């Protein structure tokens, strides 16, 4: 038995390819369900059946079980426990979830400052531990598990929480928070707040970076005196989602339709700058307009009377990105450039149309 | 980020998968076209380009340079050209030029016969070559490309080439043709009786040491990869030898047929006919056995007994119009070639093999080999 040196960019072509065949399948099959010709079925069956395999042989190729990097956790957990004068029930829960090999090495890090977190600022002595009447024994959970297109990994513990008031108080020293616009923040985007470099030695920033290099997500959950609920969705196969094409000096990005709110036309006289940017009103509603071409240092091309602006959505806040034309929808493939878009404030990644063509994420977030 | 080391075990599905992929579009466009379907025309286009792509990155995985196989024969060159008494300008083009892995374990030894086959026989000796007045120093080019979905290499002279008056004189002797006659067929035609075994030297296959190895045998070889072989020559000019080899799959229609429960493959090209027949039906002339059609007494071989342990399968070779006789038929197929090489080279009875869409081995026939 033999092996055979294949280089990682043909295998990422067959992720794509793969991706990109589970939408050409799924369309062909949902433009002819009407017609219902024994034969037809047959042939369609067997479509579905090959790309299936495909697919599977694909995965086969890349996938590797999360045990790889799950099994050195519990000594390291024991040890992390000794050295801090407290102990500590561990739990690892789905350890044969499978994800790509390319994880494998880069998940191992900051899965283990997860822990150690959790025991340093999580896990409370056992002072504390009884003062608030709770177990002796603190409990630590490293779990992972597989969720629509992602494999889910989740760190939980019973520790001290979080205390939201103590990153509002923190937070309104340096930069960001006033203080009245704190009272009517989001819960999450106070624990969101742990990742600017300025807070709490490693620091929390550092972890999410590496997650998203992935084309990962990374998120926070706690409350005080109960415990912290820290959440990494890594993605299972390539990412399929909703897009709307949109054109500038005749390129094309695209922006997911989840994001999306409504598209107006607005005008010129319709745009009126307040200090700093330009903003439209609608409906006694402030919406700061950006145009797509000076966001991405481009020029010019003839300021057409009439602009269409696709008005964002984020969280809480709303924007409006003014482009050149709407193309249309289209479901596009992600490709997997988490280590280079991941650097690029107006990009989230690339993204392959049903074209056939290459069209660059608008990165929402980053352009506010 | 830099290689990773994938199983043959799972690439090799790959391969079996793309190959249905491809067939599996085509039945599904060809059932549409039927039913008469027009609505379907964009994500068709969509699927086919996937589809497409796909093959190619599938393929180009498993290719390699050809120079891993032609880097080491310049020195064999030079080597050859020393015991011989006589010095080559030695010159190979396009190295770099890809091709399935499969090939360069299998191609080296048919090129290496066809460059030392130039050296000896083709390019003459310096007295003779002044005297024609051609460059003292004789020349042999050895180069590869990719011309539409093959891999084309040859290999060229500036030797003496062939005399086609002297071939046509040894094949009147022996059977192939009459005291003139027929000689009247394009001299490319005439230049194959080169690729008859009978031709050149004597016939023992593992005769190769202390004889030679005979130009059949290198087109043999060519065309276990499914590959095809060409010859051109002039009087005194030169010698061109060009080889084809396929950068994809190769996608034949065959009959499926069983044989003591085993399934062997007969390409749906030759099949002329297919009539259901009992063991009185065959008559044992001479050592053949025979079936009549019609009143046409035609020649009959039992697949069981042509290989090793009622249906006639007549299929037509050239003029001959003989029958095969099996168990039962399985129906037609679209089947994809696979490549082994020294596999079923020495095997006249295969052409090679073809992968079914159960996952099981179908051994393609050879029609022209029995
Ligand atoms: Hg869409
Ligand atoms: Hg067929």
Same mark, same amino acid.
């Given at each position: 038995s033999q092996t055979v040196r294949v280089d990682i960019e043909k295998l990422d072509n067959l992720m794509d390819l793969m991706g990109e065949l589970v939408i050409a399948r799924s369309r062909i099959l949902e433009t002819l369900k009407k017609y219902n010709i024994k034969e037809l079925d047959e042939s369609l069956s067997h479509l579905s059946r090959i790309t299936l395999d495909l697919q599977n042989v694909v995965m086969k190729i890349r996938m590797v079980p999360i045990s790889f990097v799950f099994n050195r956790f519990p000594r390291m957990v024991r040890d992390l426990a000794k050295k801090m004068n407290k102990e500590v029930n561990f739990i690892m829960r789905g350890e044969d979830t499978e994800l790509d090999r390319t994880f494998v090495e880069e998940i191992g890090e900051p899965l283990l400052h997860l822990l150690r977190n959790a025991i340093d600022h999580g896990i409370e002595p056992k002072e504390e531990r009884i003062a608030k009447g709770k177990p002796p024994i603190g409990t630590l959970i490293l779990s992972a598990r597989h969720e629509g297109n992602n494999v889910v990994i989740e760190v939980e513990d019973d520790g001290? &929480?979080?205390?939201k008031e103590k990153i509002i108080r923190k937070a309104?020293? %340096? !930069?960001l928070i006033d203080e009245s616009k704190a009272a009517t923040l989001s819960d999450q985007e106070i624990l969101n +707040?742990? +990742?600017?470099?300025? +807070? *709490? !030695?490693? &620091?929390?920033d550092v972890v999410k970076n590496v997650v998203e290099s992935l084309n990962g997500s990374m998120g926070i959950e706690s409350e005080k005196d109960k415990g912290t609920k820290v959440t990494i969705r890594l993605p299972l196969t390539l990412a399929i989602i909703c897009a709307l094409l949109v054109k500038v000096n005749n390129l094309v990005y695209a922006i997911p339709i989840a994001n999306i709110d409504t598209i107006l036309s607005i005008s010129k006289e319709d745009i009126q700058r307040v200090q700093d940017r330009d903003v439209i009103v609608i409906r006694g509603e402030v919406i700061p307009v950006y145009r797509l071409w000076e966001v991405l240092q481009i020029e010019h091309k003839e300021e057409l009377e009439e602009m269409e602006a696709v008005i964002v959505r984020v969280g809480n806040r709303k924007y409006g990105i003014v482009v050149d034309d709407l193309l249309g929808q289209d479901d596009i493939v992600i490709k997997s450039l988490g280590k280079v878009f *991941?650097?690029? %404030?107006?990009?989230?990644g690339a993204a392959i149309l049903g074209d056939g063509s290459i069209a660059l994420i608008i990165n929402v977030s980053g352009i506010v």
């Open positions: 001290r &929480g979080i205390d309104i020293e %340096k !930069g +707040f742990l +990742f600017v470099p300025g +807070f *709490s !030695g490693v &620091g929390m *991941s650097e690029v %404030k107006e990009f989230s």
